[PDB]
From Swiss-Prot:
This is cAMP and cAMP-inhibited cGMP 3',5'-cyclic phosphodiesterase 10A. The gene is PDE10A. Transmembrane segments: none annotated. Abundant in the putamen and caudate nucleus regions of brain and testis, moderately expressed in the thyroid gland, pituitary gland, thalamus and cerebellum. A divalent metal cation 2 binds at D107. The chain holds residues 724 to 1036 of 1055 of the full protein. The active site is at H68 (proton donor). Plays a role in signal transduction by regulating the intracellular concentration of cyclic nucleotides. Can hydrolyze both cAMP and cGMP, but has higher affinity for cAMP and is more efficient with cAMP as substrate. May play a critical role in regulating cAMP and cGMP levels in the striatum, a region of the brain that contributes to the control of movement and cognition. Belongs to the cyclic nucleotide phosphodiesterase family. It comes from the Eukaryota. It is found in: Cytoplasm, Cytosol. Homodimer. 3',5'-cyclic GMP binds at H68, Q269. 3',5'-cyclic AMP binds at H68, Q269. It is linked to Dyskinesia, limb and orofacial, infantile-onset: An autosomal recessive, early-onset hyperkinetic movement disorder characterized by axial hypotonia, dyskinesia of the limbs and trunk, orofacial dyskinesia, drooling, and dysarthria. The severity of the hyperkinesis is variable. Striatal degeneration, autosomal dominant 2: An autosomal dominant disorder characterized by striatal degeneration and dysfunction of basal ganglia, resulting in hyperkinesis.
Length: 313
């Protein structure tokens, strides 16, 4: 109760910034997450023993894949921490509790394959969940772990508060399905620009949290260039393995997943920043002005990919 997590000075200062990298010391990531829960939510939000036990079960249920791993989960939660800390008064007590947990859980038991590969392989999960296949799986795994004995971190919430927090987590995790992002941001764009956006409207909050989830999920493009560049290798290493698996089913993969088209990566990154990243952080910055450093960082990394194409690196 009088037991705070503290971090070394460089981490204590840099963890508050959007571009913070959680580092290569896996054993410090749980501590980092608890630190962020404590400052973002309070030392009273969760029973430390339950929270620690929940964090270690979540870690255990992330797999050793190149990108969609326990490091990604903690990275996505740290970006959410930075958004929440820079927008103190916009979020409910329940939202603050649920969104860091949603972020830590959002890719639980990912196998390194897209929804599309599960459907073409005819994976059991593709019969159980027809759309947002992996994301319904991630939420299902979150509920499983919350129901392990001694793992119910929400035990002190009322029956209806409990139902609301699980409903925030569910919508937040579903929103990390990038297929849903394009329409969600188009609607948020229209609402902001016609002045109809209203944060007392629960369906509007839902959309805004969906956009925050895309922002945190893609936050590799908002890091220092060397972090962005080395993360992009992990991202493509999964896509190229999926491409190999597509070729095994007798299907030419899309170029994104074809390791034979490595040379075109710099141009694929431009399309991605222009079609997905920049629009995401732009609308986010319009809705939550203090999130501007994410947009600014993303624009800097777009300019670094432009330099790569111009053979200036
Ligand atoms: C940086 C980043 N973060 C998150 C996600 C989901 N992605 N997806 C990507 C792929 C971006 C792309 N490359 C290509 C290929 C390049 C070689 C042939 C074409 C196509 N396209 C869309 N980059 C990211
Ligand atoms: Mg995902
Ligand atoms: Zn993710």
């Amino acid at each position: 109760g009088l037991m705070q997590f503290t971090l070394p000075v460089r981490l204590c200062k840099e963890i508050e910034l959007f571009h913070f990298d959680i580092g290569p010391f896996e054993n410090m990531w749980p501590g980092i997450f608890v630190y962020m829960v404590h400052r973002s939510c309070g030392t009273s939000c969760f029973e430390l023993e339950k929270l620690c036990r929940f964090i270690m079960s979540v870690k255990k249920n992330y797999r050793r894949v190149p990108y969609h791993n326990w490091k990604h989960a903690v990275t996505v939660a740290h970006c959410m921490y930075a958004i929440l800390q820079n927008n103190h008064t916009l979020f409910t007590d329940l939202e603050r509790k649920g969104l860091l947990i949603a972020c830590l859980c959002h890719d639980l038991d990912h196998r390194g394959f897209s929804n599309s590969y599960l459907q073409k392989f005819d994976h059991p999960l593709a019969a159980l969940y027809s759309t947002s296949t992996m994301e319904q799986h991630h939420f299902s795994q979150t509920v499983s772990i919350l129901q392990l004995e001694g793992h119910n971190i929400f035990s002190t919430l009322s029956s209806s508060e409990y139902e609301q927090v699980l409903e925030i987590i569910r919508k937040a995790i579903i929103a990390t399905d990038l297929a849903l992002y394009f329409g969600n941001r188009k609607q948020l764009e229209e609402m902001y620009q016609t002045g109809s956006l209203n944060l007392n409207n629960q369906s509007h909050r839902d959309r805004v949290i969906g956009l925050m989830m895309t922002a945190c999920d893609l936050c590799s493009v908002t890091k220092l260039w060397p972090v962005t560049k080395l993360t992009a290798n992990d991202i493509y290493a999964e896509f190229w393995a999926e491409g190999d698996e597509m070729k095994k089913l007798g299907i030419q993969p899309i170029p994104m997943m074809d390791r034979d088209k490595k040379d075109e990566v710099p141009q694929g990154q431009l399309g991605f920043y222009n079609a997905v990243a920049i629009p995401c952080y732009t609308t986010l910055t319009q809705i939550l002005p203090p999130t501007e450093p994410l947009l600014k960082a993303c624009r800097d990394n777009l300019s670094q990919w432009e330099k790569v194409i111009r053979g200036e690196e």
